[model samples]
Target: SMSYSWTGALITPCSPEEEKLPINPLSNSLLRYHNKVYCTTTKSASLRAKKVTFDRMQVLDSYYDSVLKDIKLAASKVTARLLTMEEACQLTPPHSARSKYGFGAKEVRSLSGRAVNHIKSVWKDLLEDSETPIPTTIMAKNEVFCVDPTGKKAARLIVYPDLGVRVCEKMALYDITQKLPQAVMGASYGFQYSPAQRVEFLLKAWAEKKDPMGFSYDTRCFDSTVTERDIRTEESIYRACSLPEEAHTAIHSLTERLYVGGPMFNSKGQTCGYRRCRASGVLTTSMGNTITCYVKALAACKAAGIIAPTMLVCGDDLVVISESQGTEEDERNLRAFTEAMTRYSAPPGDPPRPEYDLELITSCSSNVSVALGPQGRRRYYLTRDPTTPIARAAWETVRHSPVNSWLGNIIQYAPTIWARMVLMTHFFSILMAQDTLDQNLNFEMYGAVYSVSPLDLPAIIERLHGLDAFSLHTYTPHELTRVASALRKLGAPPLRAWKSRARAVRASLISRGGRAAVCGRYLFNWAVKTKLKLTPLPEARLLDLSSWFTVGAGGGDIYHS
Candidate 1:
């Protein structure tokens, strides 16, 4: 039998011929990239022992016993609604991932009936057949790279499989997702849970434990490493719960065909390769990664002699809090942790690094920087290097994309220098030019438009970082230099230019003398002295920041109102 692991391990015996990949240009490119990124898992005594005892059935049994009851109780309080085919279909963007069946995402989103009918048929067949595997259309994963300083080109992959299974996967997981992470991982899951909460958890553990330290572990190519065993384990976790049969079968088939992917093809209609690991496109990628990561990480921590272990896991992002002994002992425990993961076929990208402060360690690709707190004390928030390629594209005079990349950065890095000066300045300047300065405009992301108001910054900041939204930030000279270097590298305008633009926008906004002025006052309050009154926007209340708050990556139309 050809059984592979969701972590890309060959769990069962198969022929060498089956392992041989095709030689197409796209396939060769993918193979080259894969070879560069793939780190082979090793076997170890501790990992072998854990693997032997690794009965997800038991694990899920305990989870259900301990948390499912609480999860249901929490779910009862959530008034979230699931989208139907018609509604969900409309959420699909024109340029979304397309199918091979003669239709792109735009056509699917068209008011005409064809794409909707095809999608409806897909759901119908999925419901009508409970036991059979459904074949998913695979396409080259699309990625952008800078060809020069200003513009960029895209690279196509034969191995980077983008499955058309996303729509179906969302349909299958949507309702359960509302409750699953909350139930299974509880507060440890990052989505809907704030980074501040994560920081608080680590700090509390540190306060309660003896000499506590935290460390983050990175798993290289996590999706590419998932084995068939991992996928099956994820399926079993769901099956352990008494789900409707339709949901079960849909989930099962999706797992087998897409998540634990099979044969892959290129645009030329030739079989390019096979995916033995998890496909990144599936909706469950984040969930599967989180659960699988937690299992390996928890087992590894225990095996490594980590005392009073508390873990926060979001997909491949892992942070562990435990009692630290000495430098020598920390090295020994990290060595043991590495050994445990290697044996389990989930090797660490680098040796585990320890930090006395939770804020010091970078997890989920975000690092901590010193910022002014609400009460004028130094506060910490998650931040990343402002190095997105699309930021250049956004600066272009004729932007091709629907969403503003600058807006995404500003929202994520609200307190950062790059966002506060460059993005905010440019954004308000654009609004001033459009003469729509007073009106709240759309800031789009992942195919949905959000009615964003500069006035809502205080509320957004409060929601994302609690009181940290209003505080002044304290940055080291070195950090300030880094910010300057990053801005220069990214071709951002000078601060003086931004200050001039900000002055213009602020003056115009204040002149509006109504809700618009209130918006301007809140947005520019950090710079001004008049200290404008706070006025909340009812339209802004409809915007959902759930996707931004969580570590889970969102797909088409996943935002909540």
Candidate 2:
């Protein structure tokens, strides 16, 4: 059975050859969940299912009608222009997925002559030909490992959207996303809100309804299973807006070829490589999935009489908050949800489970975990157990792309035991070497980066995780056991060792007396030289950070709430 493997850690350091290493003693404990073959479905299978099931479900229900009407209104206000090569190149992130051609991401980031010329040619072609289908390249991304010590890989179909296509997608979809989500779905739309807002909303809704039951619904391979009908519906939405002819033609062609997907090729010869399917990673995926999933779910809720302020829908990850009648009502709602999704070709797991108590429901890799805050109030924050394999692999830098995955976890999950002890410990140690802890590195939010400061983590934690960045946290036994096992497996030092290092690091920062000291005082509070005195982030920086929502169709910085 495949499950979501939440770790973004690399795998090269832990292959069998290194078994003789001292760290191997804890390998048995870490390998417990390794045998599970965790991966998403194949592209061909997804495509086949989608074609067979296309149009079986409709979004013409009253709820979806309002949503579509609003989206059309928003799309009408959108106006876009073709981008120059330099402007288009500027949109690409530094370490994004690269093409198999002579150019890679590094070259693109540096804007080398060869890379720029190739990118310009690709963009020029897109501008010149509005109707031709663009082919996609398929590749296997070695995401993580199973307990059987096998490499668990995810199939990634890279479309390598040219600058022109990217700009066109932005022009066509940006305003719709910016305007439609909040207007139609209100507080339920995920992109219009932050995780902190999500948590607050869930808690507040639960408190108001006094509901004891909630459940997170997970869909398997939601993106790849998106059908041609769905793509057509998306195109119809654009047409309803009466967009410019060129924009309409470009979007329509992009939908038929890239959005719905075409023939896929790889480095090797075409053996099983000629399959056509919807690529999981693309410009329109998030928006399409959000709209499609919400349409089905809202229709189901209306049919089942499940009502709330709004239902939480983020692509395939869903959480329904409503007043509970009893077990029978819960079962009925589950069946209704299951039926709705199945008809739409995006079914949930068998029987479609539900959870009582808001804290138990996990959405988007975050569940409600409780601990006492500094003021001694019963504080509820969001956290998850760290992915042990990823934590262990953090000791070495082999094949690690993000360079800030662990740090990202630390920032987000500062209240969690594993993040505080393991992630923070290793991340600080690694950065101390380059004297670069003060420098800002990429903070990836769903494979893209928005500028963020490492020093600003405390402020971020204070704002997002409930002002507990420097507050002491009590760990449950289960949480402690997980962290202990991970540390041992990863060859991380014991808590005392971390404490000692943290003290010295804190003192060094205080002596330095700058941004480093501020980071040390707040982020590393274990052996702080002084009390956790967090200075306010600059108003302008906070504004920029506030606008930093997760990547959607038009990419980062497009939506601000």
Candidate 3:
């Protein structure tokens, strides 16, 4: 079946989309390619539609299900229960989209009588309707992007059910979403992995192999790759859990009525003929996609005949680090793996090739590279192209956004060259510009928001990545080349300017003293050769965010943590 069937009733935005950054954005030099950053419109959306729209097929004769057996057993031990109305209500993100019933997230959160009544009826409907396709809204997601190589890109159209259905999705799958993935796939479920854990897992996988070969598998449009059979396979995995009959029935009904492809509407509230065959902005998508990808990758591994395989799946982005038999054999297996993934995941996508160097392979938009530890020992760290981070941070500095992306990047990618040199310097300058250096700013962690003081960054970085995040220096040529190329393409300021600006931000924070000063002393130690003695934070043990980061896309997901 085709990924989507559009009836020429174009996808439209619920609100006006902002393509360019605000006029004369602060610290414009942080990103010189303002005109290059764009948002997708209805016309451009057709282009993205072409990319996601494709045929899906799964023609498997037979294959080993050893992983599937283990997955089912593990899932059985950690089953989900149907959430209560109260629990579901509390799970709504405060800034979530409004219900067609004219109620907003606050009403759901506060349990207004009418909202409660509405949700109750919706849950009842889920139990009653097994074959009727639920209605979903298709909105133009205004996520900005640098112009793709194809000249321009369109705004992605995100299809999602209404607020009531979203809450019901949480009620049905909240526990399953959190527990089943990690239980079945362990570290392969990548959203739970912190940036540091991701690096550690990759390094551990790479070192364990005698002759490691790594490759990243990308299915052009991942969300669209999912098919009804694939979704049913996911449902089967969940059904393996020892869920109660009622919960089991709810899951079954949800599968037919909501989980599978459904009817869609444009922002105009007109009934549209689009049958969404891709993963919708469901509360289940983030985990659902990872589960599908991990299962397919493991199936491919068995079919392709890897001697020893270690998979790290970050949603649809997969990196399989394995022991190489021989160069020719490795390529042969990879192409088979590509073909296997093509038929299993969907057809007509880019193919994969083997890379002898582990550092050369990229996944989850990150690659592992060498750096110098305090004792001059070789260390592995994760980093990505600085172009997008800098461009996003540039806009983050001037625009009003829900997430404080700079602060989040500092938490996750603090060790990256871009995070230390550009993100830290730019955001600090922005904070100083607003004279709120000591303020408690809100940012997300573990799918929940917390107000963290800028002064506490040193401790946060220490806890998340350890002191190595600050102590690491002398990055590898690979990372340096990627960053420079990104900078060159964006026409952003060079490294020397970053060094000078870091010195300024560093001194200001040091003068402020306390943890802020500690942040200045540790984070910007690269700005100058001289350093300060660093110690583990007394309260570094205070944090216990097991799955601190979530891949929460535009779907109004109801998972709280």
Candidate 4:
């Protein structure tokens, strides 16, 4: 069995394996993003500063939340309607233009007349059951040749994923140019829920967000001399531990976790003779026993000195167990489970335990994979801690899940951007209100350890804030002005030395445009794509950043897969 109590106070289990990590070690510092907090080695000064300025910058809280909720609801509704419209347009009525095109383009050869009629019959049955196609426009397949109202050739329309078609005539550059003013004005209203606000830190100095799961049992039971407690049961412990049925019944949404815990019964059917441990799926004990009662079973493993308590949590089934410590019982169980797990091994080999696999991906491979580059050195990892192969695998699984990756990416970079944005906003608000600037303002706008690091640009800071140099959040409007104004006025020292170095390593086309003074943004996309021998046209395209915001880092594995 595994050990659940091992990680003890944290979801991340970094103890014995800490020494094997890369250059920068994970620290206790934390940053607060939208709702969730994250762990960071970076000091808290910058985050605290941002939070301070944010409290002032945020307008009517209730209004903001309400507005965002409404916008999200509307967006969702429109998206659903669009999906329905697509579905309807894909459907074919007998003798319609789509039917004239023959069968589905991809399956015309496979679809018999009988199959077509059967599909239609199913649709009819569904319509009788209250499902009717929404109104949609259908056009002949291979239909083409169109343009914007301005008389240019229209772009090809993208097909909808559903069994429907949506012919969206693409606009020409001239036509799009005409719409620019309105687009800008419309964008000026801004999104109700700024994606920036969703960012958060991974760790916190305060324990408020890190409440450990509750455990109530005597640890002394491991000694054979100690008498085991009697079996405890409620009318329905599962129901009690789990959310009410009403939660699942909700049409909107509901979050859930597996509920597992029960007492073990002795041969006499009396409680406490053996432990019970259940999971979402079948689980075998270290000694090859099929565990049904999760909690008590984990306790038994601990008592036996088997692997540290670990839980195989997939979806709802979170089994509590520990890494085997090689005590008599632990060794026996390890041998048994290892053999059992082997039985289901994939063709490649027995997949390493989830924790082991994760350790290999984030921590171990991190040091060797220079592809991610030096910045990745700052990644939060627990490789050096108590490296239970099982726990390591679990961490890897959790961190790499689409949900976790999305969340982690936000935690990693959003804070840096967010803190800066709020500070900038705060400074601008003041500057806009008053023409006078603070001459003596100062602040620590940025910091780094490398000797080759970019110069702090003290005058730039002064110009940006119109103030003297000081602490992180202490900068005033005068400082921002000093910094920004200097960039325009003197431009003596470069704004970011790191950027210069990074560019030297790999230069690409730099974007240039703006009515106001703006630093050019160089995109490495072309260079990277070129190095991979991929065609830039297929790789580059404007896409909604919304769907991508919480989707973690943009990488080959994300989109193509």
User: Per-model C-alpha lDDT, please?
Assistant: 0.54, 0.55, 0.76, 0.21
Root-mean-square deviation of each candidate, in angstroms?
A: 9.9, 6.6, 2.7, 25.9
Off by over 4 Å in 1: 1-95, 102-113, 127-165, 194-209, 373-375, 389-398, 434-459, 462-471, 476-481, 491-497, 512-516, 529-561
Clashes (backbone N, CA, C under 3 Å), per candidate, total: 15, 4, 2, 95
Best by lDDT: 3
What is the model-wide C-alpha lDDT for candidate 1?
A: 0.54
What are the per-residue Cα lDDT tens digits for candidate 2 across 292-382? 7776677667666665625777766777777776888888877876766676566665455657766567777677666666666766666
The deviation in Å at residue 493 for candidate 4 is: 33
Ranking by TM-score: 3, 2, 1, 4
Candidates, ranked, lDDT: 3, 2, 1, 4
What is the alpha-carbon lDDT of model 2 when measured against the actual structure?
0.55
Write the residue-wise lDDT of candidate 3 on 1-561 in tens digits. Answer: 887887777777677667776546574768776787665566577677777787777665355266566677888788568888898888787767889997988899899998889988988887877778888888766655666554766667778888988888878877777678788888776767777778888888989999999888877788888888877778888898877887787788878877778878888977655554554577767677777788778888888997788998766778899999899999899888877878775443567888888788898777878789888998777777776667667776777776555676677688888788878887777787787888876555433444577777877788878888888878988788878877777667877799988998899888888767777888788887677777777767887655555433212354343
Query: Which stretches of candidate 2 lie above 4 Å from their native place?
Result: 1-87, 99-131, 145-177, 210-212, 238-243, 269-277, 388-403, 451-456, 459-467, 475-501, 528-543, 550-561
- Global local distance difference test of model 3: 0.76
Off by over 4 Å in 3: 22-27, 64-70, 148-150, 438-453, 513-515, 550-561
- The TM-score, computed over Cα atoms with residue i paired to residue i, of candidate 3 is 0.92
